Amino acid sequence: GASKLRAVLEKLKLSRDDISTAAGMVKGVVDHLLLRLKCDSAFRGVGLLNTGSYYEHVKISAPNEFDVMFKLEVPRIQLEEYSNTRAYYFVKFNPLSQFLEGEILSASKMLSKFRKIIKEEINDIKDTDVIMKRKSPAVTLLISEKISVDITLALESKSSWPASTQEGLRIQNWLSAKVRKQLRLKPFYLVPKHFQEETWRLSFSHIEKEILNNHGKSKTCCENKEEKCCRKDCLKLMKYLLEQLKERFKDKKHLDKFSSYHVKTAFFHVCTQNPQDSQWDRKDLGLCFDNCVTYFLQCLRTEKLENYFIPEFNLFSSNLIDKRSKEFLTKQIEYERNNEFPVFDEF
Numbered sequence: 001g002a003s004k005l006r007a008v009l010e011k012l013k014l015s016r017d018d019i020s021t022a023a024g025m026v027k028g029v030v031d032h033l034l035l036r037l038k039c040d041s042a043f044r045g046v047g048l049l050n051t052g053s054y055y056e057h058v059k060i061s062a063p064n065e066f067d068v069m070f071k072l073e074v075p076r077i078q079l080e081e082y083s084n085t086r087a088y089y090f091v092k093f094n095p096l097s098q099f100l101e102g103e104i105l106s107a108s109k110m111l112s113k114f115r116k117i118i119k120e121e122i123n124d125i126k127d128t129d130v131i132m133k134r135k136s137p138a139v140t141l142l143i144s145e146k147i148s149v150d151i152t153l154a155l156e157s158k159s160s161w162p163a164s165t166q167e168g169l170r171i172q173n174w175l176s177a178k179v180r181k182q183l184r185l186k187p188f189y190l191v192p193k194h195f196q197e198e199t200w201r202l203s204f205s206h207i208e209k210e211i212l213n214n215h216g217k218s219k220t221c222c223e224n225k226e227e228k229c230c231r232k233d234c235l236k237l238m239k240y241l242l243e244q245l246k247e248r249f250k251d252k253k254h255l256d257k258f259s260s261y262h263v264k265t266a267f268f269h270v271c272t273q274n275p276q277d278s279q280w281d282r283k284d285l286g287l288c289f290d291n292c293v294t295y296f297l298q299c300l301r302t303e304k305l306e307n308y309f310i311p312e313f314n315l316f317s318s319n320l321i322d323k324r325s326k327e328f329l330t331k332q333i334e335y336e337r338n339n340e341f342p343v344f345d346e347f
Ligand SMILES: Cc1ccc(-c2cc(C(=O)O)c3nc(NCc4ccccc4)[nH]c3c2)c(Cl)c1
Pocket: 058, 067, 202, 203, 204, 205, 206, 207, 208, 209, 211, 259, 260, 261, 264, 265, 268, 308, 309
């Protein structure tokens, strides 16, 4: 029954208008940061990933936790795959020559000046209270007492996607081969890794908005009441389930390695698995949500969740997340699934 799930989604939809007040605080902070960085020798080509978006909201339950990405175009960029990990690379070749450790581009040396300039500007204006938190790659600010913003620096490359993505983004049977070709013409991004190296991880997070806003096999999906689907609602419930489970056990360390990214990745694998819009009918919200929960548990038990763009990078590998952590999450979700999800009728 979709009765409980809709009420959860209705409760979630209410706190959306709280974001409008908090986001405005975030814009003023990052508008001041972008102008201070743009007149630095290394960060002349800095800017937001999306010119007006200004954020991404990882916490679908807490409207006070934002995630912001700054971009920096690195032209004539040469990448070396680090030990066949398929996702971590060295950047070698200039405004960025001050961070060169010989041939390769140092991530922590670029993060040092980036964190330094922000640290100096955060205190400089301080017409509104912004507090810097140091702890790994993200420069985490806190506006007033509630709002927290994660600022991530990313390198932008407008060349072809690296070979490891050749069989990724398997959307041909769902969104068509024409759309996959158009998406792969868009740039790709590299973010600091933070074992240990001066390597960068391939990032394709900017592709999520492109697909979430155009998500059906039918081009008119969710444009009229006759073909309203529940794809977005299922993703929201999947993200909220993990956030509640991570909140419920915040005094332990078992669920610290799982994020909405894993929940996103498994969901889009389900979208590949179920390409027809009829498989996502709104009347079947409870059933479709179960398909997502089932697949994610199958991933947890099998210790396998492929990067959606890099099929050879296992997000659930033992190097990344240990077996006891994945078994702990498996038990909690299976318990919630058997019990009609008690984490949903509370907060
Ligand atoms: C079709 C498609 C399109 C895009 C994506 C996608 C790719 C990446 C990536 O890094 O490649 C990525 N990262 C993130 N971070 C979110 C986060 C930030 C802070 C804390 C916790 C989570 N969300 C992402 C989504 C996927 Cl899974 C499917």
